């Protein structure tokens, strides 16, 4: 997260580290054993790591748990991030407490400008490189589509939407991927294209949750 702000200790409690021997990507708990993130972060074995602040420190409030199962969309397309969505379920339920905590499923789509909660251990510079220990934290709105559409021409699918500001100096950036965006207490999307890293014009690119409820809830279903 670009121009963002550090979040305060386990005020997000939904939102996950995904840990392959470090941390690569991020994600949402949605119930207490499942987890969405993004199809592009697929690893065959995938620990989650909850209830983090300091991803560096063990603090006492974290839980790890491994991943039992991982299942992206089966229309994700890899080259163009299409149905950029993932589904974990955790091999042991989630113990749900003041640090660990689920995020609503959206009951609708979120309109252009909408405030919404964007975060995550990602990058935090523009300029180079520097991946912090504590989580961060972004307000951003909820952009009109043609906005999102002259910002990646032939590239917004149905299955996308932006949050950002096209002016640049507040964005996702490389490793906040699959991570939560909220808005009005609901997820409304998962970091996809987190490469726009605060520059102009490039705004970043989230998979709309709100398409994908009833695949996430059979999803559950089939695999309960
Ligand atoms: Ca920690």
């Avoid at 708990?29 to 909850?50: D, F, G, N």
């Avoid at 042991?92 to 309109?111: F, H, K």
């Amino acid at each position: 997260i670009v121009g963002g702000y550090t979040c305060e200790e386990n005020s997000l409690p939904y939102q996950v580290s995904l840990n392959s021997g470090s941390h690569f990507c991020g994600g949402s708990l949605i119930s207490e054993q499942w987890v969405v993130s993004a199809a592009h972060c697929y690893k065959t074995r995938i620990q989650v790591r909850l209830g983090e602040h300091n991803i560096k420190v063990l603090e006492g409030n974290e839980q790890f748990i491994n991943a039992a199962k991982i299942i992206r969309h089966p229309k994700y397309n890899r080259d163009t991030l299409d149905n950029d969505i993932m589904l974990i379920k955790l091999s042991s339920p989630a113990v749900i407490n003041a640090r660990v905590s689920t995020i609503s499923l959206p009951t609708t789509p979120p309109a252009a400008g909408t405030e919404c909660l964007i975060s995550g251990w990602g990058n935090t510079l523009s300029f180079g490189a520097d991946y912090p220990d504590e989580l961060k934290c972004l307000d951003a709105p909820v952009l009109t589509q043609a906005e999102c559409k002259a910002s990646y021409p032939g590239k917004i699918t149905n299955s996308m939407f932006c949050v950002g500001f096209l002016e640049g100096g507040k964005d996702s950036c490389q490793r906040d991927a699959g991570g939560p965006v909220v808005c009005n207490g609901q997820l409304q999307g998962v970091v996809s294209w987190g490469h726009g890293c605060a520059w102009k014009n490039r705004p970043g690119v989230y998979t709309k949750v709100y398409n994908y409820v009833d695949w996430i809830k059979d999803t559950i279903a089939a695999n309960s």
